[model samples]
Target: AELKPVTISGGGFISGLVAHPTEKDLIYARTDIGGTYRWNAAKWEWEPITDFIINNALAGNGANLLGTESIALDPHNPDRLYLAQGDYVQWDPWAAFLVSDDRGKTFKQYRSPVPMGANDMGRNGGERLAVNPHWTDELWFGSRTQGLWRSTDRAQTWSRMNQLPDSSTYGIGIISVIFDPKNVGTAYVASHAVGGLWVTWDGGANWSQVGGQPTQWSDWTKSIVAASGTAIQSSGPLPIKIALGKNGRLYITYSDAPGPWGVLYGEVWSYDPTNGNWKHITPSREGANTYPAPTGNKKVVPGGWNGISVGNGDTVVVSTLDANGEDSVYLSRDAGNSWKDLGKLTTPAGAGGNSQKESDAKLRNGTPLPWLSFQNRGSGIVGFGWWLAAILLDPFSDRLLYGTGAVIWATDAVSRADSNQAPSWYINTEGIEETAILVLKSPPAGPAHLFSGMYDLGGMRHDDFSVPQPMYSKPTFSSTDGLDFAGRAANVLARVGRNDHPDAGVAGCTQGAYTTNSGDSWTLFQTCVPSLEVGNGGTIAVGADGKTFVWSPSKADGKGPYTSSDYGKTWTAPSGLSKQTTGIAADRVQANTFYVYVEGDFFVSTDGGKSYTKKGNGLPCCWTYTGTPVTSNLRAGELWVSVKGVGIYHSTDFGNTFTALAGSGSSLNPAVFSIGAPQTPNATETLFLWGIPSASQPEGLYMSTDNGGLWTRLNDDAHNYGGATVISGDPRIYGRVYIGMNGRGIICAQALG
Candidate 1:
């Protein structure tokens, strides 16, 4: 099952985008946590190029590397690419510079001493990594805190560019670095630091702040102006993007903060560095409306400026992030002297604008992706697009591409926007699945093979692995924390999440729903016991008989560990179960039995969750890092428990006694989760684990057909999916597995021939 993979198609947050200068149709997209993807022109889709880093044995910290800070391409060499990789700049702080020769088919990694923050505040900023067009071997990296770094030999090694002063003065550090396409050794660096923008005529030898830049507003009456200074004020704007147009003009965008949200002011500017001319082209000075009605830049938009792309001649485009009502994409010619609100345009062929309509944005076939979830779930405003961080006009054609919080959007008639015409936009991201999967379940027998819980988008039912299914409706959750299907009644399922109904506003209590026929339809729990106004949806378990259900919320304010027997029509607090219980599961073959793991003890409930009693004690504790998962099996009294940093354990006496699996040995540390599958109808259940079999073994997916007596590692370095949050093996199909990932979405693996 680990050999061949399929994605449960759900696009996540795309942070940046880039295109090869000379290679037509060659493009790349960088995500916050899902790694990088390259545009596959042949298939007209985006192909994940960093799947090789998914738990790759060679990549020690695969999870950190997937957070791509920035990506750069050698303009003179279309086949060469560069990626700045890291998730955080602290803690383990694993960062690297990777050089790819076949457009990311392969990579040569150079470990970096400096850390990066691809998943941090300023992730939506300009490309911090840049390659010298004239000297393709030379590269520059703008670090989040340590400052600017340079590599002279294709990132073989790096040295801090010491010539730059106070490199780490910015709130979020260096935001951008770019070389003049027509002028070698002359580059610009824009930071959220003292020097808002810096220019170097002699490459990295020296740099000076660009003068005559907008520091304060000329008309504060009509604008939301902040106290001016070199650094970002408490609520002031910072340089967000820098781009060079084909006409050798430079454009810059500014936002109050590096934002996908929490924005109040923004600005856009253009510069002819050759002539030392600057133009304040900001479109709005107050809120959503355009101001000044004439040839002047006297206003600041009431949103964050993002995604500046200059096309042929004087044509340029930019998008607003988290605007007051409906965010927008704007088009400008004549160097931004005037602007056209493209987001407000009406295309005769299709609907355009940021309105809550199922007909707003669709694929070419007129079908909207269920995963994109076009509107803000609770707000009712369909985002013209949030995270409007990356928008570009194809250098070779009028084709335009822009990244949203979810999918990448495209328009072939982008030039029409220059004439105040609507450029019909459509969702163009295919083969790009970066959903944050929270939990996954594969019923032993059901109409659908798999069901998933997600972080932002609601859960899904996979009846056809090859097709995209609409997200769960009716009691839709913004984040599904857990999902479970009955062991005996595999067709029945239950899920818990932070629910927000389209008509009802926020749920008044912790939300949950149940399905009777394999999730084709769902009904909300008739009522919640504690009935809290809000809480993080927590773990759920369904008994083998499909009658008993238990819910344990981590943040229910000490009220829960609730048990329901009438399919969630009502609930009662189990007597002995601790309110702080973390992992809970049902005994697959024992209809009235349940188990709970809290701290270091295992508790059992034999009276249909009426009361729990501590059955096992002195187990390794579950601290901040480890998740102690308790799972039961098909055979009566058979159970499994995995305590990370400790070995796997099993018990045949209903959790009364547990013995660590000898094959895993003392050094073999299991991860948070594992699952059971059947090798045959009557054979001992096959164990599929996400763990490091021993200290010498790399963490990976493993399977044992002989009751843990022997094991076979399932995934190689190239197919690990950057590890998983939850894992499940199919009981119906011997070698099939389902992996729920943090950012790469749910992956279904079928054993290869």
Candidate 2:
């Protein structure tokens, strides 16, 4: 089958965006957990460049390489690229340094002793990796834990510069590493702490702290200290980012914390290293700014600065992390001496209050995707955007791009800022899929081909996959975790999830929803069991007849296996089922039959889930508490059970007996399993799995047309996106499979013609 993304663009936090100084349209975007992407100029999309690094068949830890800490490009040669890939520093103890010669078509990885925390706090800091502009083959990296490291042979090897001093605590790091434009021996590094800034003139030899730097401590009486407590008073403002402007002048931003949050005070500065001159050109020094909070109250405070960019002729742009309870972008044409709030640059002549609302709405309407508005989903104000870390103005053109918590915002008319006009920005994210697919369901018969449950963006119904589809509206949840459809009545479906967003509007029924018209509209469960309200909305099972339902919460304490015969209108706690019983499945053809699996034992219910009896024992225990280990096939008394690390179990006569599928006995372990329509009419169903299958085979997505006798590996190493949480094959279309990723969104594989 040919693998392709299922088209949910930029659904995660984008940490940074870097433009190649020498080449137009050659830009890179880095995500906190979804790896890196290369800007496809021809398609106007962000093409994933690191999808091949997250499989187990390859050499060293591919799973941990999804979090890209920093990216460095060779300005002299556009084809050369360097990446520092890692996520949690402590869990994954080693970071990877990858060198790509063909812009990212291929890579040669080098293991580093320093572990980079691309997914940890301060992830939005400045680029920690840099290529020496004057010396193209030489590279330098300011690490999160280790102070400094240098590579001379195009990133093939590395040695730590122990001479560089740093005051790094956990989660903080040396964030910026920059080289002088004219001198081969001069460079600078900015630490994300009280270490301030340092400079070196002899290249590899020595370093000294820059003098006359700002030394302001965060005020304890500020809003951040009051909201997060006064322990923050122990720290002072430090250099979080530094950018080299025209004529060897350094534009810098300082904050009390290296953060996308918990920032109360900040300052902006410009330095002339040539004459050792410093200028404190902070846009506003006092706490006078106010913003509309989600509570309708006003947040009045002076927040810290994050991203800073420099354009031609004293043009400087800076972004605030938590200024006025929300973020804003400010532009300055006179080297930060005077500034204008770009967030309100487009205000109408008479309309006075803050114009940021108008600016955000205009930009939101300019994008192709509708979910950015939060639509019927109440996600608070998406204003200038939070986690305002990566901001860049193309050195070749007037184009500009900035990273946000969701998608990257871009504007081609940034030159309009100089003319005192509002520059329009839009979502420029195309071919960028960074969401987590929690569950997927493709019914045997329905107008909708796929129904999804996502991690944070709720669920979606896709009738067409060629274009982007809107998220669920009206009664939408922030995350939909469970979905099941009635076998006989294919139009009937049940869904369960959680909505932590205060404005979601489904106050009485936040745990479950049901659709009778093939998901055209939904009706929420007005009354949920006490257990459903406690934990995340857990797994749901629908009886074949479409009248019975079984709810199993992920964390029900001593409570569930609540059964309802009237479409979730009411629930009855069934006896004989243990507490927190996960992995529930309804019989596909039998009217009032259901099954449950937990803690290595299997149970069966014959009376519409009102009661249950133990049927089998010694099943492979929990793969995950939330994952369903048991699933039913189309015919009567047919069942399939997955034992993760053990094997696949099949039963033909209800739960009376089970046989281990061939090749899946002991040597083959499937993480997830699914059954699809036969390749030919009236033939045995096709079997699919995301697993190692057998000891001789490598870990991959596999399919079997001959029941379980033989399997064909459907995915190559490049398509294995680490966590394959759920897998489902299209029942109506043979040889098609939907693989749910943990963080890289959903992937679809169709048979090659």
- How many backbone clashes does every candidate have? 2, 1
Clashing pairs in 1: 284-300, 285-300
**Per-residue lDDT of candidate 1, residues 1-753 (tens digit):** 435334445367889988888889988999988889898777777788877564323224443677788999998888888898877766434678888888888898888878888888878888999998878778888888877889998987989987876443443677889998888788988877433788888977998878776665335422334333123233333688888887888888887666766656667878888788987776654332342132223333355688788877788888877664446677777667777776666422343345433455566556556655522333323556677888888878888888877777788887676566677777776777788887778888978778888877776787777656667877677788878888898978888887765425533243787888888777777776464335457778898988888877656455537888876667788777646555778888879788876666778898888898988643554453334555645687787777766667778788888777754447667765556667777677777777777556677777777766666777777766667667887767777778877678777765665
Q: Please give the lDDT score at residue 98 for candidate 1.
A: 83
lDDT of candidates 1 onward, in order: 0.72, 0.74
Residue by residue across 565-663, what tens digits does model 2's lDDT show? Answer: 875567888778866664788887788788877766777888988888877543444443223444444577777787756788777777777677776
Candidate 2 has an lDDT of 0.74
Q: In candidate 2, which residue pairs clash?
A: 668-693
lDDT of 1 at 248: 86
Candidate 1: regions farther than 4 A off:
1-10, 54-63, 167-171, 218-236, 285-301, 346-353, 356-361, 365-367, 374-382, 502-510, 529-535, 556-560, 566-570, 617-633, 694-697
Give the worst 10-residue stretch by lDDT in candidate 1. 291-300
TM-score of each: 0.90, 0.91
